[PDB]
């Protein structure tokens, strides 16, 4: 059975007075698991999870030369302190530095952005709105199952952009590594249109398998942001994917 | 003297654990009063105070036919419940309905928007960024002192746009009226660049004088938004402008 | 509750608001969206009285349309004659003249308009019985002109919709000058009147309540033997508006 | 000052009843630090640290097609349980799977192995001994300072192999990652020729700097192997490189 619902994971959302969805994909078995098949297939603004395709396109087009190229702060103080400095691709993805990616999107332009998202089969492929803000308050929407389909292509270097572009973005996605697992992932927090949601999408590399994941959860305030990773890890532990 | 600093108004900011400026202009005496000349001249994003020039331009170019024309809710559920309904110019200005004004700005377009703000001598006249979001996160900046200069021209029908455009916007600015005074004004809340500030700009019509006002204050959360009107009214009452 | 399709529905319960103040009169309401009227007294709702200072609305419109008044800033110099109402004994503009019901300013407008244009304009406006018989500068106080509360509403609806046979500008300036009350829940544009020259002495308040998604037109009059009860015009109207859930 | 001696670091060695050297290189400042200048320049058998150059050569010559290619266990039960199974480049590096790298070395051959170590300026460049064991019991010798020189070239993609080969080996070196730092490194344990020593070589990636490191310590028994990483992290902590 390709897709199975496991409502026992709702206890992790309940425990934290939260509502949301975790989707897992066992790459070896080609099987999916979620607490909520309906919500797994509901589309939301990608917010900063869009930094994964945006990075790939920026690299492929040479808007980003490499992961060391410096993107100057515009000197506007914003409310995430780590944003108010020069960045490279690694630090811009680590700290979700929106203004750096807004500059990439302007240099990419609407025609190339649209073509690339169609070829990626990325969400509804709709860039309507401002080319520098559409993933925040424009027409683009993606479901957790659609995030998994896209991430599997990236994992296997199967996107049409260069192998090099794909390797550099996976390096930039690096979030955690230890003796048991590697996590490559991207957070997002969509606030400009309801419902306000938190994302975490990516994969867990084990010695002998890869588990893809995409989660979103209701996030009425920034107070709950750490629950994005905390709830995913509680599900990964329950399923014995990580110790 | 054209400008005088009255630091006693700081008592009103301090009582509300707040920081900001109130600027008053006595039209009859051509004299200004502020608690803080320095902050009175600091330029900030106008945010929803931009709905005053945006309304004028939209009416002058016929983007808005009249104050009854209905602008249909686009069906995207947003944060402010009153935005999720149809609006005319009157209700759109009352509830600060951004999406309505974003549509006005797109129809106006960057060339006419830029030229109109130059004719108005409006703040730094800089519309850099997205034509539909520059007053939220683009290049435009205006100080409390510069808001007064603009509002005086609107009050006297001295802006280059039609008298009709000016009359309809002043109708739309109506905020409060009783047997003692009329307030025409517009709130704003700038959150996308630091420092987050609240605005209230407009004027008090008396039988035999007009007092222009422009106030802004630090607004780290939405909890303090009522302080924009409350602190301004404390100053107006101290100065015997209103009971 | 009320019935659909009905033109005018009587609600005698509002008489309680008059009786409380040892008074009697009529409130008429018109729901613009629903095209339905309500009154405590179907007979008095339709009784035609001298308009007295409510005439300042059409008088204002005609004076502006003909250029007798240039704009709402033009100063009308006090003629030097000390009258009973202190607020009349000073310079006025259209805004302050309408707020303080400054009869002498409007008498001067009426003489400049003159009988032929005043008559033509009231016919174009379908205003009350359209009769200006009497002194060109006092007919709305002691001449032949008569208007009911329902006819005040008819006229006011045309003004609200800029449908009177004068410039849009004239209509916008007069609606500005009618501004009486505003807050985050409602706006009232209205004009008071006090007919004292011909019995029975009555008080008026006519205008409308602007809501986000509707307009409620109103016209009230009440017996007013002395100026002591003039504040009851607004007070009783607000009791009715509160009862009908039009204002909180 | 090219190299500074900091003997206060010896406290990390004595607290662990151990003797050895840590060498750090601050890439931004082009300055080195060590607890023992003379041992920093002492050349030892590289043992499994040789897996870094061997991986690069194997990739560039196509012995390894990519990091997914499976290297079938030869069926020989060996002392380290994790070696008794199939491996790819990632797991062969993680578990230091000598037999996989011995097969790489036979496929590379003496002539190409020699030319590549000359091209890399690697240690004494001397491969004399068994083509499949010279890094364990042959003539090759490298100091901690020479490990850092070699690693700086790999970090900057300056070795005379392709950018792709360098990017794949740096992926395979991934050891630890969190919100504070990333460590790419390789352990070694030289037991075949006295003196028995342990290695750890690699670097710490920070947001704004890279700290290269090479440590070796006396290792009479396998009981102290965890001290390779533990003593290095005690130094990084003392220098405020990691929290
Ligand atoms: C809020 C929005 O800018 C968000 C996004 O684009 O998804 C940024 C800010 C954040 S969380 C900071 C909280 N800010 C709330 N406005 C992240 C993240 O953690 O990935 N990305
Ligand atoms: C938030 C921003 O759009 C702001 C503006 O553009 O000035 C909106 C929201 C608000 S306050 C509503 C509560 N805050 C939500 N951001 C107002 C205002 O009062 O003028 N306008
Ligand atoms: C009395 C008459 O002039 C009257 C009118 O024209 O309607 C004036 C006086 C007044 S109230 C003054 C009370 N004394 C009246 N004699 C008003 C009003 O309330 O609109 N207007
Ligand atoms: Br392409
Ligand atoms: Br590559
Ligand atoms: Br990596
Ligand atoms: Br056009
Ligand atoms: Br001016
Ligand atoms: Br007009
Ligand atoms: Br008005
Ligand atoms: Br080892």
Residue numbers in the entry:
A (entry chain BBB), B (entry chain AAA), D (entry chain CCC): 23 to 265
C (entry chain DDD): 18 to 265
What text appears in the publication on this structure?
To reveal the effect of chloride on imipenem hydrolysis, we sought to obtain a complex structure of OXA-48 in the presence of halides and imipenem. We added 500 mM NaBr and 32 mM imipenem to the apo OXA-48WT crystal and observed a clear Br– anomalous signal overlapping with the density of imipenem, indicating that Br– and imipenem compete for binding to R250 (1.53 Å resolution). R250 has been proposed to play an important role in catalysis by binding to the carboxylate of the substrates. Through mutagenesis and molecular docking, we established that R250 not only is important for substrate binding but also is the target for ion pair-induced enzyme inhibition by chloride. To further explore whether the binding of halides at R250 is a key driving force for the formation of the inactive acyl intermediate, we performed ITC analysis and showed that the OXA-48R250A variant no longer responds to the presence of chloride with biphasic features but the nonconserved OXA-48R214A variant still does. These data indicate that the binding of chloride to R250 is essential for chloride-induced biphasic kinetics. After supplementation of chloride, binding of chloride wedged between the imipenem intermediate and R250 results in progressive rate retardation from the accumulation of the inactive intermediate formed during catalysis until a new active–inactive equilibrium is established to deliver the slower steady-state kinetics observed.
Among these carbapenemases, OXA-48-like enzymes are widely disseminated and plasmid-encoded, and antibiotic resistance in OXA-48-producing Enterobacterales can lead to high clinical mortality rates. Though the catalytic mechanism of OXA-48 is known, the molecular origin of its biphasic kinetics has been elusive. The partial inactivation of several OXA carbapenemases during turnover has been observed in the literature. It has been proposed that it is a result of the decarbamylation of the N-carbamylated catalytic lysine residue (KCX), which acts as a general base and is critical for the acylation and deacylation steps of the reaction. Our data and analysis thereof show that chloride ion acts as a Janus effector: it delivers allosteric activation by binding at the dimeric enzyme interface while independently causing the inhibition of steady-state catalytic activity by misorientation of a reactive intermediate by ion pairing with R250 in the active site.
